[PDB]
Every structure is written in structure tokens, then in C-alpha cells.
Amino acid sequence: HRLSAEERDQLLPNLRAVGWNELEGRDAIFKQFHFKDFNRAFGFMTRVALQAEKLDHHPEWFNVYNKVHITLSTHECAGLSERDINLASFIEQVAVSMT
Amino acid sequence: HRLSAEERDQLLPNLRAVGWNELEGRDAIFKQFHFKDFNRAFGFMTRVALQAEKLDHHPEWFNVYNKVHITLSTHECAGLSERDINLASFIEQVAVSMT
Amino acid sequence: HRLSAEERDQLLPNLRAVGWNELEGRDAIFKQFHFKDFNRAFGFMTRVALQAEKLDHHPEWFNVYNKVHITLSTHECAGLSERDINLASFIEQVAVSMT
Amino acid sequence: HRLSAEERDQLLPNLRAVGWNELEGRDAIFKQFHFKDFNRAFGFMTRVALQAEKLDHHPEWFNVYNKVHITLSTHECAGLSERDINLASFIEQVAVSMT
Ligand SMILES: C[C@H](O)[C@H](O)C1=Nc2c(nc(N)[nH]c2=O)NC1
Ligand SMILES: C[C@H](O)[C@H](O)C1=Nc2c(nc(N)[nH]c2=O)NC1
Ligand SMILES: C[C@H](O)[C@H](O)C1=Nc2c(nc(N)[nH]c2=O)NC1
Ligand SMILES: C[C@H](O)[C@H](O)C1=Nc2c(nc(N)[nH]c2=O)NC1
């Protein structure tokens, strides 16, 4: 459940490429999203919410109007997990739709 | 209120082009949407929900898993008003983001 | 999977008490909810939608402004399953808070 | 409409009373909510989201699973206003409906 560099090295890339980035002193990824508006932003969170509930993996996230910042780290391992990756992947599917 | 003639025959045609039909036995229009899953189906509903509350115009919708069926009519006038109109168009635009 | 009669007799009453009721032409439970407004109704759909997804069991539902009708049946058995019942149980919980 | 000092005294009270706080640094009130789970947490955001939109007054909130931090201030007049107040009040009703 914890990211071994081989994994990181194979997983991280596609995310990094679209904007994901690792933080300092904490094993987690972050990304800022910026929609045109709230309708879109919320709709975007809603779909994420559904899935989060579906996989039992939650994001750390902030919102103001049309911006949403997301942070992903798994609680047990206390860093990244295959879980962060998928959620993230999923998130990406959703973001592009609105945009 | 109560779209007259011309407008009707100015405004609706665009909606019909897009699959909107006229309800038989009521002054309404309706259309059904089919999505890949519920995640899309609900997310779609939410965004339409924020808008409805915002305009103070609510649809009559039915949902099952990935299908969403929508009826639009104005209760005040017991029929199609421009309210319905705009809502539909917005709904269409939302449609597109997920379809 | 499909409820036996012993089963129905065990689970049903509690729901029947509350206001749920078998359908006439089919093996499902129905219940119509009424709220003060849309905010509330939509709010309540949101909580069940989350729940619906968590356990992959969805409802046939209908909404207009502040009313919500919910029909439950486990499709795969083509009638009542436990799913329907748990779900119904949950819908009851959500419903009581917005009282 | 950056609320007067007279105005503050009359409105804040009920708010102050419930745990709402004023921030040093900026004209804004804040509050941290805690729920039993994400479902509630999210069902909560949703109702709020609906009001936010209706009003055209959005929050600055962060969520991580079951708690949500809310920050209200009015961009328009760079400080607290009748709105943040109204809104905040509303947030409180919604919160109550969460068990
Ligand atoms: C039991 C535990 O609450 C559950 O497995 C969850 N864990 C986590 C979660 N979300 C994150 N980010 N990390 C977790 O460890 N949501 C659900
Ligand atoms: C005051 C009133 O109930 C409010 O403006 C609403 N009107 C309407 C509505 N929805 C419809 N379809 N028609 C209305 O006239 N939802 C909200
Ligand atoms: C694949 C299938 O659509 C999926 O397993 C679902 N099944 C069911 C469902 N909801 C109910 N009530 N019953 C099901 O059998 N929603 C999701
Ligand atoms: C046009 C303008 O962006 C709009 O009226 C909004 N204003 C505000 C808002 N949110 C806050 N907190 N303050 C505002 O002045 N969300 C929407």
C-alpha cells in the first residue's frame, strides 16, 4: 500500500504531466483546478464525491467559487497508495469533461 | 408566459432538432438522457439542480441508474413559457459535457 | 435472494409501518416523500445517491420540486432483495433529519 | 455593504454564540464543522451549495472527509456583510439537520 519508487516512477508520470505534483515532507500529490464557474466546479466535486464514497477514499480539498484544490494521500501507509493514483486518474477523467 | 405561436414556431424547432419532444396531452416538452453510469447521471442532475434553484424553475425528472427523463413546463401558466426554454438549453449544454 | 414469504414477513412490517407499500403490478416497494422545498429534497437525494453508489444498489425515483417518489426492487432477482430493504432503511434515516 | 460596527453587535451574537469566529487579518468569520461521516458532510455541502448559487454568494470551504471549515466574507465590499450573515444562518439550519 505504499509507493515504491518503481511504482512512483511508473505511476506518477502521467499525472505529473497534467499538473499533479508531490509535496514536501508529506507523501502526497496535489493539483489545482480552475473551472469557469461554480456550477461546473461543484458538479465536478459531486462526481468526485460519488466515487470517493464508492471507493472509500477521500480527497483533501478546498474550494472557492470556480477553483478547487485537491490533495491526495492515503491514511494508513501515510503517503501515496495505488488508491491515490486511481482517484487521481478518475479525477482527471472528470475534470476534462467540464473544462 | 404561454409561448404564443411564432415563438413556439421559432424556439421549439431548435429543441426538437436536438431530440426534445412534445408531450402528448400536456403543454410540455420532454426528453430523455442516457449516460454511461449513475455517476454521470447524478452529476448531470446536480448541475441542473444548481441551475434550477438559481432560476427558480424546476424540472420534473425521473431517474434510474444511468437514465434521466425530463419534463419541462411552467406551473404558473400551466404550460410552456420561456422559462422552460432557457432551462432546456442549459440542460442541453450540460448534457454535452457528460455525453 | 428474492425474499421468501417468511422473509417479507420479517422485514416488511417495520417499513410498512413507516409508509412503504408494495406495488400492485410488481414486486417492489414504493414510498413518496414530501419536503418543505427543493433544497431539502435535492439534499436528501444527494445523501442517498452517495449511499446508492457505495453499495451499488439504485432507486427508481421521481422528483418535482419538493416531492420525491422512490420505488425499490432488486432487478437481478426481479423482486425484493435485502438490498431494497437496507437501502430503504437508510432512506428512512436520511429522511428523518430533514423533518 | 461592509457591515457597520452597530450592525456587527446586533448580528454576530447568535453567530458568536454558535461557534462562529471573527478573523484577525481580515474581515471574515469562520467556523469548523464536524460530522459523523462524509455522507453527511457532503449532503451538507450540497444544501449549502444550492443556497450559495441561489444567492450568488459563495463560501471558502475545505473538506477532508467528515469536517468542513467555512469562511465567509464578501468580495464586493472586502469584508463581512448582511449576506455572509444570512448565509451563515442558513448554514446553521442545515447543520442541525445532520445526524
Ligand atoms: C476506515 C477508513 O476510514 C477508510 O478505510 C478510509 N481511509 C482513507 C480515506 N481517505 C484517505 N485520503 N485516506 C484514507 O486512509 N477515506 C476512507
Ligand atoms: C414562487 C414559485 O413556486 C417559484 O418561482 C417556482 N415556480 C415554478 C417552478 N417550476 C415550474 N415548473 N414552474 C414554476 O412556475 N419551481 C419554482
Ligand atoms: C451492473 C448493474 O447495473 C449494477 O450491479 C446495479 N445493480 C442494481 C442496482 N440497484 C438495484 N436496486 N438492484 C440492482 O441489482 N444498481 C446497480
Ligand atoms: C459577479 C460576482 O462574481 C458574484 O455576484 C459573486 N460575488 C461574491 C461571491 N462570494 C462572495 N463571498 N462574495 C461575493 O461578492 N460569489 C458570487
Coordinates of all heavy atoms in Angstrom, one line a residue, chain A residues 34-83:
Chain A
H34 N -9.3 24.8 -12.0 CA -9.9 26.1 -12.2 C -11.0 26.1 -13.3 O -10.7 26.3 -14.5 CB -8.7 27.1 -12.5 CG -9.1 28.6 -12.8 ND1 -10.1 28.9 -13.7 CD2 -8.6 29.7 -12.3 CE1 -10.2 30.2 -13.7 NE2 -9.2 30.7 -12.9
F35 N -12.2 26.0 -13.0 CA -13.3 25.9 -13.9 C -13.8 27.3 -14.1 O -13.3 28.3 -13.7 CB -14.5 25.1 -13.4 CG -14.0 23.7 -13.0 CD1 -13.5 23.5 -11.7 CD2 -13.9 22.7 -13.9 CE1 -13.0 22.3 -11.4 CE2 -13.4 21.4 -13.6 CZ -12.9 21.2 -12.3
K36 N -14.8 27.4 -15.0 CA -15.3 28.6 -15.4 C -16.1 29.2 -14.3 O -16.2 30.4 -14.2 CB -16.1 28.6 -16.6 CG -16.9 29.8 -16.9 CD -17.1 30.0 -18.4 CE -18.6 29.8 -18.9 NZ -18.7 28.8 -20.0
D37 N -16.8 28.3 -13.6 CA -17.8 28.7 -12.6 C -18.0 27.7 -11.6 O -17.4 26.6 -11.6 CB -19.1 29.0 -13.3 CG -19.7 27.8 -14.0 OD1 -19.2 26.7 -13.8 OD2 -20.8 28.1 -14.6
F38 N -19.0 28.0 -10.7 CA -19.3 27.2 -9.5 C -20.2 26.0 -9.9 O -20.0 24.9 -9.4 CB -20.0 28.0 -8.4 CG -20.3 27.3 -7.2 CD1 -19.3 26.9 -6.3 CD2 -21.6 26.9 -6.8 CE1 -19.6 26.1 -5.2 CE2 -21.9 26.2 -5.7 CZ -20.9 25.8 -4.9
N39 N -21.1 26.2 -10.9 CA -21.9 25.1 -11.3 C -21.0 24.0 -11.7 O -21.2 22.8 -11.4 CB -22.9 25.6 -12.4 CG -24.0 24.7 -12.7 OD1 -24.0 23.9 -13.6 ND2 -25.1 24.7 -11.8
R40 N -20.0 24.3 -12.5 CA -19.1 23.4 -13.0 C -18.2 22.8 -11.9 O -18.0 21.6 -11.9 CB -18.2 23.9 -14.1 CG -18.8 23.9 -15.5 CD -18.1 25.0 -16.3 NE -18.1 24.8 -17.8 CZ -18.9 25.6 -18.5 NH1 -19.6 26.5 -18.0 NH2 -18.9 25.4 -19.9
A41 N -17.7 23.7 -11.1 CA -16.8 23.3 -10.0 C -17.4 22.3 -9.1 O -16.8 21.3 -8.8 CB -16.3 24.5 -9.3
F42 N -18.7 22.6 -8.7 CA -19.5 21.7 -7.8 C -19.8 20.4 -8.4 O -19.6 19.3 -7.9 CB -20.7 22.4 -7.1 CG -21.0 21.8 -5.8 CD1 -20.0 21.8 -4.8 CD2 -22.1 21.0 -5.6 CE1 -20.2 21.2 -3.5 CE2 -22.4 20.4 -4.3 CZ -21.4 20.5 -3.3
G43 N -20.4 20.5 -9.6 CA -20.7 19.3 -10.4 C -19.5 18.5 -10.5 O -19.5 17.3 -10.3
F44 N -18.3 19.1 -10.6 CA -17.1 18.4 -10.7 C -16.8 17.7 -9.3 O -16.5 16.5 -9.3 CB -16.0 19.3 -11.2 CG -14.6 18.8 -10.8 CD1 -13.9 17.9 -11.5 CD2 -14.1 19.3 -9.6 CE1 -12.6 17.5 -11.2 CE2 -12.8 18.9 -9.2 CZ -12.1 18.0 -10.0
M45 N -17.1 18.3 -8.2 CA -16.9 17.7 -6.9 C -17.9 16.6 -6.6 O -17.6 15.7 -5.8 CB -17.0 18.8 -5.8 CG -16.1 20.0 -6.0 SD -16.2 21.2 -4.7 CE -15.8 20.3 -3.2
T46 N -19.1 16.8 -7.1 CA -20.1 15.9 -6.8 C -19.7 14.5 -7.4 O -19.7 13.5 -6.6 CB -21.4 16.4 -7.5 OG1 -21.7 17.6 -6.8 CG2 -22.5 15.4 -7.4
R47 N -19.4 14.5 -8.7 CA -18.9 13.3 -9.3 C -17.7 12.7 -8.5 O -17.5 11.5 -8.3 CB -18.6 13.4 -10.8 CG -19.6 14.3 -11.5 CD -19.5 14.1 -13.0 NE -19.0 12.9 -13.5 CZ -18.5 12.6 -14.7 NH1 -18.5 13.6 -15.6 NH2 -18.0 11.4 -14.9
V48 N -16.9 13.6 -8.1 CA -15.8 13.0 -7.3 C -16.3 12.5 -6.0 O -15.9 11.4 -5.6 CB -14.7 14.1 -7.2 CG1 -13.6 13.4 -6.3 CG2 -14.1 14.3 -8.6
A49 N -17.2 13.2 -5.4 CA -17.7 12.7 -4.1 C -18.3 11.3 -4.3 O -18.0 10.4 -3.5 CB -18.8 13.6 -3.6
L50 N -19.1 11.1 -5.3 CA -19.7 9.8 -5.6 C -18.7 8.7 -5.5 O -18.9 7.7 -4.8 CB -20.6 9.7 -6.8 CG -21.9 10.4 -6.7 CD1 -22.5 10.9 -8.0 CD2 -22.9 9.5 -6.0
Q51 N -17.7 8.9 -6.3 CA -16.6 7.9 -6.4 C -15.8 7.7 -5.2 O -15.3 6.5 -4.9 CB -15.7 8.2 -7.6 CG -14.7 7.0 -7.9 CD -15.2 5.9 -8.7 OE1 -14.4 5.0 -9.1 NE2 -16.5 5.8 -8.9
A52 N -15.6 8.7 -4.4 CA -14.9 8.8 -3.2 C -15.7 7.9 -2.2 O -15.1 7.1 -1.4 CB -15.0 10.2 -2.6
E53 N -17.0 8.0 -2.3 CA -17.8 7.2 -1.4 C -17.8 5.8 -1.9 O -17.7 4.9 -1.2 CB -19.2 7.8 -1.2 CG -19.7 7.7 0.2 CD -18.6 7.9 1.3 OE1 -17.6 8.5 1.0 OE2 -18.8 7.3 2.4
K54 N -17.8 5.7 -3.2 CA -17.7 4.4 -3.8 C -16.4 3.6 -3.4 O -16.5 2.5 -3.1 CB -18.0 4.5 -5.3 CG -18.0 3.2 -6.0 CD -18.1 3.2 -7.5 CE -18.7 2.0 -8.1 NZ -19.0 2.1 -9.6
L55 N -15.3 4.3 -3.5 CA -14.0 3.6 -3.1 C -13.6 3.7 -1.7 O -12.6 3.2 -1.3 CB -12.8 4.0 -4.0 CG -13.1 4.2 -5.5 CD1 -11.9 5.0 -6.0 CD2 -13.2 2.9 -6.3
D56 N -14.3 4.6 -1.0 CA -13.9 4.8 0.4 C -12.5 5.4 0.5 O -11.7 4.9 1.3 CB -14.0 3.4 1.1 CG -13.7 3.4 2.6 OD1 -14.0 4.3 3.4 OD2 -13.0 2.4 2.9
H57 N -12.3 6.4 -0.3 CA -11.0 7.1 -0.3 C -11.3 8.5 -0.6 O -11.9 8.9 -1.6 CB -10.0 6.5 -1.3 CG -8.6 6.9 -1.2 ND1 -7.7 6.5 -0.1 CD2 -7.8 7.7 -2.0 CE1 -6.5 7.0 -0.4 NE2 -6.5 7.7 -1.5
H58 N -11.0 9.4 0.4 CA -11.4 10.8 0.3 C -10.2 11.7 0.0 O -9.1 11.6 0.3 CB -12.2 11.1 1.5 CG -13.4 10.2 1.6 ND1 -13.3 9.0 2.2 CD2 -14.7 10.4 1.1 CE1 -14.5 8.5 2.2 NE2 -15.4 9.3 1.5
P59 N -10.6 12.8 -0.7 CA -9.7 13.8 -1.0 C -9.7 14.9 0.0 O -10.7 15.1 0.7 CB -10.2 14.5 -2.3 CG -11.7 14.3 -2.2 CD -11.8 12.9 -1.6
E60 N -8.6 15.7 0.1 CA -8.4 16.8 0.9 C -8.6 17.9 0.0 O -7.8 18.0 -1.0 CB -7.0 16.8 1.4 CG -6.8 16.0 2.7 CD -5.5 16.2 3.4 OE1 -5.0 17.4 3.3 OE2 -4.9 15.3 3.9
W61 N -9.6 18.8 0.1 CA -9.8 19.7 -0.9 C -10.5 21.0 -0.5 O -11.3 21.0 0.4 CB -10.5 19.1 -2.1 CG -11.8 18.4 -1.8 CD1 -12.3 18.3 -0.5 CD2 -12.7 17.8 -2.7 NE1 -13.5 17.7 -0.5 CE2 -13.8 17.3 -1.8 CE3 -12.8 17.6 -4.0 CZ2 -14.9 16.6 -2.4 CZ3 -13.9 16.9 -4.6 CH2 -14.9 16.5 -3.8
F62 N -10.1 22.1 -1.1 CA -10.6 23.4 -0.8 C -11.3 24.0 -2.0 O -11.0 23.9 -3.2 CB -9.3 24.3 -0.4 CG -9.7 25.7 -0.3 CD1 -10.1 26.3 0.9 CD2 -9.7 26.5 -1.4 CE1 -10.5 27.7 1.0 CE2 -10.1 27.9 -1.3 CZ -10.4 28.5 -0.1
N63 N -12.4 24.8 -1.7 CA -13.0 25.4 -2.9 C -13.5 26.8 -2.6 O -13.8 27.2 -1.5 CB -14.0 24.5 -3.6 CG -15.3 25.2 -4.1 OD1 -16.2 25.5 -3.3 ND2 -15.3 25.6 -5.4
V64 N -13.3 27.5 -3.6 CA -13.8 28.9 -3.6 C -14.4 29.1 -5.0 O -13.6 29.0 -6.0 CB -12.9 30.0 -3.5 CG1 -13.5 31.2 -2.7 CG2 -11.5 29.7 -3.1
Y65 N -15.6 29.4 -5.0 CA -16.2 29.7 -6.3 C -15.8 28.6 -7.4 O -16.1 27.4 -7.3 CB -16.1 31.1 -6.7 CG -16.9 31.5 -7.9 CD1 -18.3 31.5 -7.8 CD2 -16.3 31.9 -9.2 CE1 -19.1 31.8 -8.9 CE2 -17.1 32.3 -10.3 CZ -18.5 32.2 -10.1 OH -19.3 32.5 -11.2
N66 N -15.0 29.1 -8.4 CA -14.6 28.2 -9.5 C -13.3 27.6 -9.4 O -12.8 27.1 -10.4 CB -14.8 28.9 -10.9 CG -13.8 30.0 -11.1 OD1 -13.2 30.5 -10.2 ND2 -13.6 30.3 -12.4
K67 N -12.7 27.6 -8.3 CA -11.4 27.0 -8.1 C -11.5 25.8 -7.1 O -12.3 26.0 -6.1 CB -10.3 27.9 -7.6 CG -10.0 29.1 -8.6 CD -9.3 30.2 -7.9 CE -9.8 31.6 -8.2 NZ -11.3 31.7 -8.3
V68 N -10.8 24.7 -7.3 CA -10.8 23.6 -6.4 C -9.4 23.0 -6.3 O -8.8 22.7 -7.3 CB -11.7 22.4 -6.9 CG1 -11.7 21.2 -6.0 CG2 -13.2 22.9 -7.1
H69 N -8.9 22.9 -5.1 CA -7.5 22.4 -4.9 C -7.7 21.0 -4.3 O -8.4 20.9 -3.3 CB -6.8 23.2 -3.9 CG -6.4 24.5 -4.5 ND1 -5.3 25.2 -3.9 CD2 -6.9 25.2 -5.5 CE1 -5.2 26.3 -4.7 NE2 -6.1 26.3 -5.6
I70 N -7.0 20.0 -4.9 CA -7.1 18.7 -4.4 C -5.7 18.1 -3.8 O -4.7 18.3 -4.4 CB -7.7 17.7 -5.4 CG1 -9.1 18.3 -5.8 CG2 -7.9 16.4 -4.7 CD1 -9.8 17.3 -6.6
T71 N -5.8 17.4 -2.7 CA -4.6 16.8 -2.2 C -4.9 15.3 -1.9 O -5.9 15.0 -1.3 CB -4.2 17.6 -1.0 OG1 -3.7 18.9 -1.5 CG2 -3.0 16.9 -0.2
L72 N -4.0 14.4 -2.4 CA -4.2 13.0 -2.1 C -3.0 12.3 -1.4 O -1.9 12.2 -1.9 CB -4.6 12.3 -3.4 CG -5.7 13.0 -4.2 CD1 -5.7 12.3 -5.5 CD2 -7.0 12.9 -3.5
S73 N -3.4 11.7 -0.3 CA -2.5 10.9 0.5 C -3.4 9.8 1.1 O -4.5 10.1 1.6 CB -1.7 11.6 1.5 OG -0.6 10.8 1.9
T74 N -2.9 8.6 1.2 CA -3.6 7.5 1.9 C -3.3 7.6 3.4 O -2.2 7.8 3.8 CB -3.2 6.2 1.2 OG1 -3.6 6.2 -0.2 CG2 -3.9 5.1 2.0
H75 N -4.3 7.4 4.2 CA -4.1 7.5 5.7 C -3.3 6.4 6.4 O -2.5 6.8 7.2 CB -5.2 8.2 6.6 CG -5.2 9.6 6.3 ND1 -5.9 10.1 5.2 CD2 -4.5 10.7 6.8 CE1 -5.7 11.4 5.1 NE2 -4.9 11.8 6.1
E76 N -3.5 5.2 6.1 CA -2.7 4.2 6.7 C -1.2 4.3 6.3 O -0.5 5.0 7.0 CB -3.2 2.7 6.5 CG -4.7 2.6 6.6 CD -5.3 1.4 6.0 OE1 -4.7 0.3 5.9 OE2 -6.6 1.5 5.6
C77 N -0.8 3.8 5.1 CA 0.5 3.9 4.6 C 1.2 5.3 5.0 O 2.4 5.4 5.2 CB 0.6 3.7 3.1 SG -0.2 4.9 2.1
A78 N 0.4 6.3 5.1 CA 0.8 7.7 5.4 C 1.6 8.3 4.3 O 2.6 9.0 4.5 CB 1.4 7.7 6.8
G79 N 1.1 8.0 3.1 CA 1.8 8.5 1.9 C 0.9 8.2 0.8 O -0.3 8.1 0.9
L80 N 1.5 7.9 -0.3 CA 0.8 7.5 -1.5 C 0.5 6.1 -1.6 O 1.3 5.3 -1.1 CB 1.6 7.9 -2.8 CG 1.6 9.4 -3.0 CD1 2.3 9.7 -4.3 CD2 0.2 10.0 -3.0
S81 N -0.7 5.7 -2.2 CA -1.1 4.4 -2.4 C -1.8 4.2 -3.8 O -2.1 5.2 -4.4 CB -2.2 4.0 -1.4 OG -3.5 4.3 -1.9
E82 N -1.9 3.0 -4.2 CA -2.5 2.8 -5.5 C -3.8 3.5 -5.7 O -4.2 3.9 -6.8 CB -2.8 1.3 -5.8 CG -1.5 0.4 -5.6 CD -1.6 -0.9 -6.4 OE1 -2.2 -1.0 -7.5 OE2 -0.9 -1.9 -5.8
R83 N -4.4 3.7 -4.5 CA -5.6 4.4 -4.3 C -5.6 5.9 -4.7 O -6.4 6.4 -5.5 CB -6.1 4.2 -2.9 CG -7.2 3.3 -2.8 CD -7.7 3.0 -1.4 NE -6.9 2.0 -0.8 CZ -7.2 1.6 0.5 NH1 -8.2 2.1 1.2 NH2 -6.5 0.7 1.0

